[PDB]
Amino acid sequence: SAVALPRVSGGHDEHGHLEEFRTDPIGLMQRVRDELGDVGTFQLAGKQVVLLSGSHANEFFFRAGDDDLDQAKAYPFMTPIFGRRKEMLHNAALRGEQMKGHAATIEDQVRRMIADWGEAGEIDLLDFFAELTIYTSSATLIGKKFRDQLDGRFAKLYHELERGTDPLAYVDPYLPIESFRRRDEARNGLVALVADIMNGRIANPDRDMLDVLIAVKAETGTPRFSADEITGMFISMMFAGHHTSSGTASWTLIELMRHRDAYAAVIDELDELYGDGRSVSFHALRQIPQLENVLKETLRLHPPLIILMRVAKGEFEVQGHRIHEGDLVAASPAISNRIPEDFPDPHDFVPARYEQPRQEDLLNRWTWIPFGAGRHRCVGAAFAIMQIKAIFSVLLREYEFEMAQPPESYRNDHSKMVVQLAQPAAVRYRRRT
Numbered sequence: 001s002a003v004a005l006p007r008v009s010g011g012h013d014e015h016g017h018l019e020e021f022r023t024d025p026i027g028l029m030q031r032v033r034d035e036l037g038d039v040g041t042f043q044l045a046g047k048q049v050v051l052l053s054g055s056h057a058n059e060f061f062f063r064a065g066d067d068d069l070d071q072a073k074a075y076p077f078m079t080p081i082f083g084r085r086k087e088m089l090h091n092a093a094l095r096g097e098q099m100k101g102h103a104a105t106i107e108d109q110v111r112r113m114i115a116d117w118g119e120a121g122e123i124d125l126l127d128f129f130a131e132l133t134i135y136t137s138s139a140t141l142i143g144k145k146f147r148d149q150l151d152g153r154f155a156k157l158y159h160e161l162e163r164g165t166d167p168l169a170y171v172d173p174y175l176p177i178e179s180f181r182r183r184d185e186a187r188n189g190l191v192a193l194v195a196d197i198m199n200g201r202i203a204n205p206d207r208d209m210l211d212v213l214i215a216v217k218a219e220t221g222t223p224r225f226s227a228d229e230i231t232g233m234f235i236s237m238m239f240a241g242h243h244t245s246s247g248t249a250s251w252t253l254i255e256l257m258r259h260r261d262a263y264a265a266v267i268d269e270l271d272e273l274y275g276d277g278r279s280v281s282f283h284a285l286r287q288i289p290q291l292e293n294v295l296k297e298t299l300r301l302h303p304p305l306i307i308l309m310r311v312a313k314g315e316f317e318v319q320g321h322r323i324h325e326g327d328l329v330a331a332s333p334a335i336s337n338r339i340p341e342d343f344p345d346p347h348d349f350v351p352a353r354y355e356q357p358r359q360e361d362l363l364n365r366w367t368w369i370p371f372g373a374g375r376h377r378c379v380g381a382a383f384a385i386m387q388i389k390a391i392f393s394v395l396l397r398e399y400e401f402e403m404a405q406p407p408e409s410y411r412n413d414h415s416k417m418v419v420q421l422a423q424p425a426a427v428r429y430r431r432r433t
């Protein structure tokens with residue numbers, strides 16, 4: 001007896017539109033908007049997703065209180081990965097007064113990663129940036145000491161965790177599928193790496209977070225936290241900022257290479273700015289215009305999170321369409337960031353959009369959403385931007401990059417809820433001079 005909301009075409013497979021969502025989620029979300037407008041739905045297994053788009057619908061979505069649109073249970077694929085607390089996990093390291101030190105830490109991690117590059121060579125962006133950001137994340141959020149005890153193994157296993165986010169999780173996150181199996185196995189591997197580090201510290205003692213948790217005794221003198229508990233906490237702290245920063249660093253370089261005029265502009269800028277003799281820790285926290293605009297455009301075109309989920313906790317009305325409790329409600333940066341009315345020539349790379357005269361990011365407060373908006377806006381935004389500035393201030397002044405494959409061959413893999421750059425993503429480098 002209730003009015004059914006508009007539903008997008010297709011979705012006749014076993015789990016509705018889920019199968020298409022696993023193969024081409026952006027095409028699906030775009031068809032929802034093309035056929036229905038600002039409010040439309042698609043079937044995700046046994047759930048109905050009310051996909052909102054456009055300034056009006058997005059405003060409702062982002063300004064909604066935690067009591068109206070709940071985020072907590074919107075991402076089922078995360079529970080098996082982790083194994084209020086949101087503030088704790090990040091807040092601490094994101095304090096402005098700590099940014100300078102983090103920038104210096106990031107610079108050091110980058111230099112360490114490129115220490116063996118030599119005069120010239122070739123890298124794969126996913127392998128490089130995924131590993132690099134594991135080191136930047138662990139160093140800044142857990143401690144340099146802890147990072148120094150990590151190698152490529154931790155990175156490989158963390159990546160397996162991320163790949164264990166198939167949309168099938170919306171059916172059941174524990175289904176006996178290979179990606180879920182590899183996910184659980186990788187988490188056990190991570191717990192083992194942590195246990196090994198804990199043991200090593202026992203035998204032979206700049207203290208970090210692990211030293212703190214390790215010293216915490218219960219009452220009988222027995223350690224309070226197990227390797228599993230600690231690893232779960234560490235995984236939690238590093239997740240929000242890993243795939244996002246990794247992917248964004250990859251696309252920033254790709255777009256720079258695809259657009260040599262912007263690349264040249266950034267180079268000139270970097271050389272001039274650093275001509276003042278100040279460190280990356282100083283400049284990564286201050287204006288670097290051209291690079292910043294290249295980053296903003298890269299994020300508009302390649303938002304690491306293409307869909308944002310919520311669970312309706314009540315009935316609401318958006319444009320005459322009624323949302324019911326239990327309804328999954330979503331917004332899409334992938335789609336919204338390319339609305340033609342809001343962003344002239346939305347498929348074109350135009351950093352100038354963000355220059356003082358245009359400022360399309362600030363003008364479209366509800367549709368330029370790579371970092372989300374409203375109360376749930378990305379709390380790591382300032383940090384992520386600082387990181388890009390620090391990373392490229394190093395890379396672009398030390399090396400020159402060129403695509404080793406067709407410009408159009410670089411693409412993302414959208415088969416999992418966590419988007420990852422697809423491979424190969426081969427790039428050649430050569431020392432600058």
Ligand code: HEM
Pocket residue numbers: 071086090094240241242244245248299303304305308309369370371372373375376377378379380381383384385
């Ligand atoms: C340029 C890279 C990044 C992008 C594009 C990005 C994007 C986003 C987006 C779109 C959201 C909203 C999710 C939602 O509404 O469900 C978000 C949330 C969040 N991000 Fe990021 N993020 C980035 C880097 C980071 C980093 C490095 C950290 C770690 C400090 C971080 C921590 C968080 C947290 C804790 C939330 C949840 C905020 C809340 O519930 O209010 N992000 N991010």
